[PDB]
RNA sequence: CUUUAAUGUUUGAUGUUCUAACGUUGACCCGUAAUCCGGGUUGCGGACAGUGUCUGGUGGGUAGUUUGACUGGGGCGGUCUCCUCCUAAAGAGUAACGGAGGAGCACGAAGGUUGGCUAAUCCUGGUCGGACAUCAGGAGGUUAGUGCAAUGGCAUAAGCCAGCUUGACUGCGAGCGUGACGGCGCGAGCAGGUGCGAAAGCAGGUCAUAGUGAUCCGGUGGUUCUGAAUGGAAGGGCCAUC
RNA sequence: AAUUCCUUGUCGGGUAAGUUCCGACCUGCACGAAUGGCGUAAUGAUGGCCAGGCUGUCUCCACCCGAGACUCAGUGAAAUUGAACUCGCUGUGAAGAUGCAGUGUACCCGCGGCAAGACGGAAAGACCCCGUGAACCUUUACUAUAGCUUGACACUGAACA
RNA sequence: GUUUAUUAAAAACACAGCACUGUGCAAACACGAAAGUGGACGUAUACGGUGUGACGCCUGCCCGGUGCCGGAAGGUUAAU
RNA sequence: UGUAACGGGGCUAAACCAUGCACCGAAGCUGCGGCAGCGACGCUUAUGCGUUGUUGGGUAGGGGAGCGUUCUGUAAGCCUG
RNA sequence: AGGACCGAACCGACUAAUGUUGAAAAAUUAGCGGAUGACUUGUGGCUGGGGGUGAAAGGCCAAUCAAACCGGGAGAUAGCU
RNA sequence: UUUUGUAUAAUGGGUCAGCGACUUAUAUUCUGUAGCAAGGUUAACCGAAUAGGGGAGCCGAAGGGAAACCGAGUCUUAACU
RNA sequence: CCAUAGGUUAAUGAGGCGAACCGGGGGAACUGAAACAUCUAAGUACCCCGAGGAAAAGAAAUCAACCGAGAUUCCCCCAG
């Protein structure tokens, strides 16, 4: 009655904090907005967060709900 | 091209194109030759006679691929832009 | 499943068609969508819910 | 003997300027209205045969 | 022209009759001192039967073959692709006939944008009216909702309502993710043309993750790209697509 | 019941005692009428059961007569065989030890005899599984085909309605 | 009576007898690319096939399935 | 099958616990001698050494370097009654 | 008279024991069935390999039979030893 | 020898002696080496005949594109940051 | 009836063997496709007929391509 599972989707954080990125680089492939988009970060259609400018990855905690933003410092 | 029984690479990819029939009778002449033609006049024969294109060849073209020196009169062959400038720059003459 | 495939043909003289799917049963009316025609290079009305 | 070309491979790969082989992409023959235009637009240009597969291709195409 | 009448004429159809092709494993004669065969006379049948090529049906009489894998031996049962959670050891991945569930779509609005709004449940009052249909007020806080599983998300709403709409665009794409590969995914930006908005802007489908099928062969539309003397065409290619 | 699983069904007969046998009952898992039903005299190197006689079958073996076996003379094989200076036990160990460990026992060599072991000898296990192995057999598996069968054209025509 | 020569002699095969069915003679049927031959120098009281298996008492119901036989109206249906 | 659950004898410590100092113990490390590989380095230059560091268990397998056999040329030469 | 009865030759082969590197690649010994018939036997002939023949066992077809033997395709093929 | 693992009571071999298994041909690719070098090389054949002729051809010096076509560019696209 | 069939005699030729090569009439399957049926193996093996020192083919109702070539056969390319 069992014996099935899907293929593993390889989510998670692809570039960590302080890690230098190019523009276009995917930072967190994820499933809802567990991590939100910050400065110079875009959120794709499947809530993939990608580097919209070059620089360094900056994980932060902002706002009244303590959300986890991801900025990019210009570098 | 046997991958165990998996469908092989040459058989899971689509096929494209066709063979021209006409590209087998076109040729492609450099500028390093045509100092080799014995005459200073270049037609399809005068190239065939110099063992430089082949007997079956009907069309020829005079690509810039290096260093024409003598004045050469090209007749009835297509010449590229850069090589028209290079034939006409080193004396030369191109009529068609 | 039930949902059929149709060709939205261009109202200009071209043969260019978009293609899509329609529920033929619940929506029997034809489908007109002002789509982009790349041969004319202009947004033309498209017709023909097959 | 003289080596026979795997003939249906010659219809599918074509040699390039530095020895690599180009091929047409799969997945663009039929069932098509279900696919996004972004897929189909990215499957139209021809592509190089990857590193894994050149061994197989060079074995099938010894004169090209 | 329509419709009809007589004649001649041109051909097919059907039934009766006929002798002349063919059959004769009927009789007699001859080769011949021979129940073969051939020839002759005659009888009977006779355009049939029979055989050839073509063709439908029947055809284990005969022939060639096929009749999956996983599997706590094999069979029997179950399973085989894809999505979600756990196992899974706080990056990714990770097995078992381990534990649990789902998909093989839907939608021309349930997509785009602009403007607005905020749930479940319970209590109280109130015509029919009831434990529960509508109304009003309060508590409550998203226990709700999300087209369909589960997980992660969602108030700036991704939820709910309305106006206008077709960006559910076409050509590309820096850069990345992900796979042995085939492949799959994310993508700012550039060009052309568009929608909404006063504008900043947003829009290359849907809150996301399932909703699927390589190649060959072939069908349909477009494009002289090719087109075996030449001009066409057929066929092929390329683009779309089944 | 050549058929009955449950089952050694239940009752009766035979027996001191009868899963078999005979008769009967019928709840026939799953008989049954020419893939014949039920009877059936005679027949059977046929299957099952009972009894008389008879006996070394047996209780339980004993003796004897012969042919080998044993000794001498003559001739003179065979299977097998990595090599052997080839013991017991207890344990270990590719998991059942002549060869390892611990220990115990054992002068060297034959002859008759027995067969417990040498996972003894003979035969690339016949069962089981596997091989995209084979062979024959079957069928409403697939594809063909011989044969049978259908029509068209050919061989193959007239004379009248 | 027959049978597994060489582990099975039997309840199996055979059998007389019964039935069904085909067959009108250039018979059906069989061997045979064919000619021909067997059937048989026979002729339905005969011959071939199939089942059952002396004899006695008997052989019940079912024609929906598969087959066979018969029918020709209509539907569908090849070569041409 | 035979003690047969310390390997055995045997042990009242030759057992266990705590502390300490000895010694035994391997193809480990060191000493002495030798060979080979890979580096580095001053010459030697077509490479060897005053060196110098370090390495050398090995199946499938890869790489490198050799020995022998028979036959052909060198060879009507050179050994050999 | 009789696919009649008893029983030798003759044909067979039911049981037991021996034999099982045999005396024998199927027998010997002691019993056993048929024994005028659908019997048995001699000599010759005919039928042949997907074929024969079969009182049917998948039996027999030269000690070979769910497809003889010989030669060839042929060094079939063997993801196996 | 096969194996995760064999003294294994798993396979093979009584012993000796002789024979007994990665070859050959033709294509293609890479490495070494030799010749010539923007060139290299001939095949069949002629033949004083391993010489010399024979450059038919093949490979390379130019790619892109399905193809026409273009060409140090080309394809895509109406055009490409 | 004429005549043909037939009969008798004479003359000439043939018949059979042989290794390969050659032309023609028939013609597999194992195998490969990692199964198998189209396909392959392969017009191979084999069987049969015939001929010669060679056989066969052969003197364009052939190519080519707006220029031309000039029967057949064999070899090297073309070209995997």
From Swiss-Prot, chain A:
Keywords: Ribonucleoprotein, Ribosomal protein, RNA-binding, rRNA-binding, tRNA-binding. The keyword tRNA-binding applies. One of its GO terms (molecular function) is rRNA binding. It holds the Pfam family Ribosomal_L27. PROSITE patterns: RIBOSOMAL_L27. One of its GO terms (biological process) is cytosolic ribosome assembly. Transmembrane segments: none annotated. The keyword Lipoprotein does not apply. One of its GO terms (cellular component) is cytoplasm. Disulfide bonds: none annotated. Part of the 50S ribosomal subunit. Cross-links to the 23S rRNA. Cross-links to the A and P site tRNAs. Belongs to the bacterial ribosomal protein bL27 family. This is Large ribosomal subunit protein bL27.
From Swiss-Prot, chain B:
Belongs to the universal ribosomal protein uL15 family. It comes from Escherichia coli (strain K12). This is Large ribosomal subunit protein uL15. Transmembrane segments: none annotated. This protein binds the 5S rRNA. It is required for the late stages of subunit assembly, and is essential for 5S rRNA assembly onto the ribosome. GO terms for biological process: cytoplasmic translation. GO terms for molecular function: rRNA binding; structural constituent of ribosome. The gene is rplO. The lineage of its organism: Bacteria, Pseudomonadati, Pseudomonadota, Gammaproteobacteria, Enterobacterales. Keywords: Ribonucleoprotein, Ribosomal protein, RNA-binding, rRNA-binding. Part of the 50S ribosomal subunit. Contacts the 5S rRNA. One of its GO terms (cellular component) is cytoplasm. The keyword Hydrolase does not apply.
Swiss-Prot record, chain C:
Disulfide bonds: none annotated. PROSITE patterns: RIBOSOMAL_L33. GO terms for molecular function: structural constituent of ribosome; tRNA binding. GO terms for cellular component: cytoplasm; cytosol; cytosolic large ribosomal subunit. The keyword Membrane does not apply. It comes from the Bacteria. Surface exposed on the 50S subunit. This is Large ribosomal subunit protein bL33.
Curated annotation (Swiss-Prot), chain D:
Pfam families: Ribosomal_L35p. The lineage of its organism: Bacteria, Pseudomonadati, Pseudomonadota, Gammaproteobacteria, Enterobacterales. Part of the 50S ribosomal subunit. Belongs to the bacterial ribosomal protein bL35 family. PANTHER family: 54S RIBOSOMAL PROTEIN BL35M, LARGE RIBOSOMAL SUBUNIT PROTEIN BL35M. The keyword Ribosomal protein applies. GO terms for biological process: cytoplasmic translation. Residues 9-21 have a biased composition (Basic residues). It comes from Escherichia coli (strain K12). This is Large ribosomal subunit protein bL35. Residues 1-21 are annotated as: Disordered.
